[PDB]
Design an enzyme around this catalytic site. Structure first.
Site, PDB file in Angstrom:
ATOM      1  N   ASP A 127       0.877  -1.160   0.000  1.00 27.60           N
ATOM      2  CA  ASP A 127       0.000   0.000   0.000  1.00 27.60           C
ATOM      3  C   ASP A 127       0.922   1.219   0.000  1.00 27.60           C
ATOM      4  O   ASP A 127       0.717   2.154   0.781  1.00 27.60           O
ATOM      5  CB  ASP A 127      -0.972  -0.008   1.193  1.00 27.60           C
ATOM      6  N   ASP A 164       6.904   1.596   2.938  1.00 28.01           N
ATOM      7  CA  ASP A 164       6.843   0.703   1.848  1.00 28.01           C
ATOM      8  C   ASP A 164       7.857   1.072   0.821  1.00 28.01           C
ATOM      9  O   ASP A 164       8.523   0.246   0.325  1.00 28.01           O
ATOM     10  CB  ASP A 164       5.518   0.801   1.108  1.00 28.01           C
TER      11      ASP A 164
END
Ligand SMILES: Fc1ccc(NC2=NCCN2)cc1
Ligand SMILES: Fc1ccc(NC2=NCCN2)cc1
Ligand SMILES: Fc1ccc(NC2=NCCN2)cc1
Ligand SMILES: [Ca+2]
Ligand SMILES: [Ca+2]
Ligand SMILES: [Ca+2]
Ligand SMILES: [Ca+2]
Lengths: 304, 304, 302, 304
Positions: free
Chosen positions: C8, C13
């Site tokens: 996501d 990330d």
């Protein structure tokens, strides 16, 4: 139709109110005041002037905040006159009589009305300081209001006080953003400065702001004279168009577009309204029925 | 000393409130709640927990605003737990009883307090949202307040670096700006995030948040567990330091610098503050009497 | 090592992606997107931003599911800024360019890859909705994956770090339960939210997410800036650590326990996980080699 | 009328497909299967059985998911027999030939049909796994579907596999919940187990599932035998009622209520369908035209 009016009563605000006063389907339940075009003190007196000249000093008038939410006073020309109402003479209208002013702050008084009055509507003609503070304090109360009609913004990014920003939303962009992010945009109709220039009138060809005969005509002619000049001989009826849409509904609108709106809060484009097509955004009126607009303005000026 | 507290009752707020309760010369006249560390509903419950554990329900609790003025909520459940007070068990503390909440809005109640209590002081432990709204609606009222003690902001540290994690002003930079530009900075004292960072305790070396044997000690130990673990074994006592300074005055403060204070509301540094040496500025505390601070912390946990 | 990443793409990330890009023994065969930290559209943009900053657009990007499986949309958050990547300005990165997105649904592309690419591993950095639906649609395919590296879960009890910092499993508990009860836990390694707080760094003491000199450092510094302000001046490497473990393996791990995990799908603890000592259970990492971790983060910024 | 059918090839499923096959205005554009009453393996066989017995195997058959979303597969006390279709003999029917089955997964097939077939309707006769996943993967596709007709639930709160739960929605309650919260309930018509028990029939007193003369009557009679014994000599035609309502619509609904449904996803009432009056919820058919129903059930059995 139950209507609340938040105003920085300069010249075009005053006509907006006349439009609401004249239609009997409209009950004005309160008028809140804020310092935009001129100081709060001048606004309060100018709302008084307008009610008196119309002959219905029945509506409670509430003083609101004294400055924008966080934004400074900046630097303006007196586009609406030193007094904010075209520098008119009270003896030309008989309004050297005392001014009425309720005790409660307009924020508290708005919140109360959104709780204790059913199907309440609000017509916003001003920088959104009062409204945004009411949504910050009691969003649950303000959210009971049935619909928001707002004069503000320019969806084509063409402002008036700034190349990019319309006056109401450049004067308190935080307040505008608060409204656009706290009250449902789907229940919000907008009369922008883009609309007011599109539906503008050359003042040499249209005379409906240029009559004597009664006090309402005198008031409208004398207040509108300096701003008609400032606007380059054009009539740009920003606030009256917002009142027009509020009172007459779908009949007032020739063309609109659902537009999600959001505020630019930094840079040279501070106060610009960003527009994005969204079926649950604001009803951004794009074209009004100008003939019905001039009709109701002439009728409110009629002797009869 | 008459004292108003504004809080987003999280873990260090609660200890900070305990400091004000423990000193018999402070009368807490009211506590307003705002959603910072956690939601407004949790803050209200956690203030209630704190008063019940201490044993004094004679302090009115008021609810304030549902959100920051413009910015999003920024709640920190990973640091203060899901309920904002370390997820303690009310059944373990006997605090599973109805919560106390006055009917008046914190903003209105603060204005009335400023207008009717001589020598009122305010200790602000949260985003200044509530206080900013009160300054906008009734600055004449809030200006009556004798002195502001504020936990917030982050100024130049030891080595001309400002440390990383300031919360309160970052969380509502518009509210902080309104307080800084409307309430006189000269009557403002600051317990800054810089202060707290430079008065942090290795929890392995200091046990004063790890005692047992009475209720208050159980309450401190359990509530500080998550934040200590989340801080790598370190106690960073931001709100206690502020309460320390407002309560114990000149005996709390070793060194301090008068600084004019400013929020950055635009560009990459939005939410940071500006600090200029200035003799009419805020008294920004630079060093504390840490020995006495631990003392007062231990004392309020005593069996008396 | 061949590797699929599910993200996501928010702040941690992206750095986790960069860890994978930076090691030449790793082959990223595909990145799937799910809306968690931010909307799917923002995740797609942010994966693209991260690939462009590094210099390898050769990796196909696939769009996945829009919402949790069963849990209702509780409104997109903003911990990672409005755009999910700390609200960075693309004009400072040269990333104001068209975005790449394949046409296949992430669920179908992953199933295809699991069927066709020998010794496929997966790094799961987000709510598991995509993996759950792929598991539910084509279990015989997903079960071919060599190993699962999952960022998610928190210890709830036997510690002081709140389980309430956990996001991925709480955001879609049903998806996590599906993965945990369908893909073999022995073949699963867990980089928990507990891990991310225990192996966190005081940013006032570590400057490795605060360099410039080149594009990667500027990306890393500006994206992490807002989330360090959140998290109280601390770097909580949730996804990077998961990428650390996936890429560096036993070198990454200091301590670890085998724990059978299951989700609590009802009651006041919905979204939490039960852990039970079991050596057919998940490899749940308790401690990472932090010194090697920092070395790995500075190197890719070199 | 373009209809997609989702089922698990069960006793009462087969009759419902026969109702749709036997109507000349129904275009069955596809049949997706799911492991409900029995294994997906058997469902595919049984769907093949039904189409051969009727004589139009021109309709594509898709295998879907093998298990519920979250729940385990259940111990089947053989409601529909070991093979799911009453344990009938293929040689008694000549349906011992090769099966047909498309390669594509039913989820992907349904999604493609939603994206490419105008005015597509769906008859859901089974646990809702396939539909839920299709919904989760491509909501924009599945929302194009004109209407949902579903056999599931029991607004009674009186189930069959469970005191509280109807079989299909008990067997995959998450799937059921996903459909009810993602696809417009207004565009949904429910034939519940309540409905099926309301419009039941004593087999001792009714004949239409006990006739001989062709392959079709041999089929219905022999398939329906073990299960009407199961219901204790009564015929509760759950899936046939759903096909009836879908194929006939308002030509078979005697009485129906608008009820918003939602699932209980835990406890002993797992799989129970909760119901609130709601004018934009599911049309929950409370009673159909048993006469018109038994008529069309006879029309399809009279020698072709
Ligand atoms: F910066 C400004 C420039 C022009 C105007 N003119 C106008 N406002 C309402 C009716 N006419 C206002 C602000
Ligand atoms: F509720 C929460 C608030 C902040 C964070 N912080 C964080 N998530 C990933 C990397 N850093 C986590 C949960
Ligand atoms: F748990 C169950 C109890 C009764 C039945 N009977 C039936 N289902 C369809 C037609 N007749 C099925 C399941
Ligand atoms: Ca105005
Ligand atoms: Ca605080
Ligand atoms: Ca992630
Ligand atoms: Ca069935």
């Amino acid at each position: 139709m139950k209507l609340w009016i938040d105003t920085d009563c300069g010249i075009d605000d005053a006509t907006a109110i006349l439009i609401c006063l004249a239609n009997p389907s409209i009950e004005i339940v309160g008028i809140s005041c804020i310092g935009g075009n001129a100081s709060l003190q001048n606004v309060i007196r100018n709302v008084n002037r307008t009610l008196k000249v119309w002959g219905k000093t029945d509506i409670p008038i509430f003083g609101g905040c004294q400055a924008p939410l966080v934004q400074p006073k900046m630097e303006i020309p007196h586009i609406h006159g030193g007094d904010g109402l075209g520098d008119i003479n009270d003896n030309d209208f008989g309004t050297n009589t005392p001014n009425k002013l309720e005790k409660e702050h307009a924020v508290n008084a708005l919140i109360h009305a959104a709780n204790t009055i059913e199907d309440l509507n609000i017509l916003c003609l001003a920088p959104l300081t009062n409204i945004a503070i009411a949504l910050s304090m009691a969003p649950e109360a303000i959210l009971k209001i049935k619909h928001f009609y707002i004069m503000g913004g320019a969806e084509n990014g063409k402002g008036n006080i700034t190349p990019y920003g319309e006056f109401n939303w450049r004067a308190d962009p935080e307040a505008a953003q608060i409204v656009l992010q706290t009250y449902p945009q789907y229940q919000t109709t907008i009369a922008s400065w883009t609309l007011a220039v599109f539906n503008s009138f050359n003042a040499n060809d249209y005379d409906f702001f240029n009559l004597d005969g009664n006090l309402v005509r005198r008031f409208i002619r004398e207040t509108w004279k300096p701003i008609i000049a400032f606007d380059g001989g054009r009539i740009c009826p920003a606030d009256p168009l917002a009142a027009f849409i509020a009172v007459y509904g779908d009949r007032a609108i020739k063309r609109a577009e659902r537009l999600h709106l959001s505020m630019v809060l930094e840079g040279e484009k501070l106060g610009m309204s960003l527009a994005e097509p969204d079926e649950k955004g604001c009803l951004v009126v794009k074209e009004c029925d100008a003939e019905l607009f001039v009709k109701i303005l002439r009728e409110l000026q009629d002797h009869q």
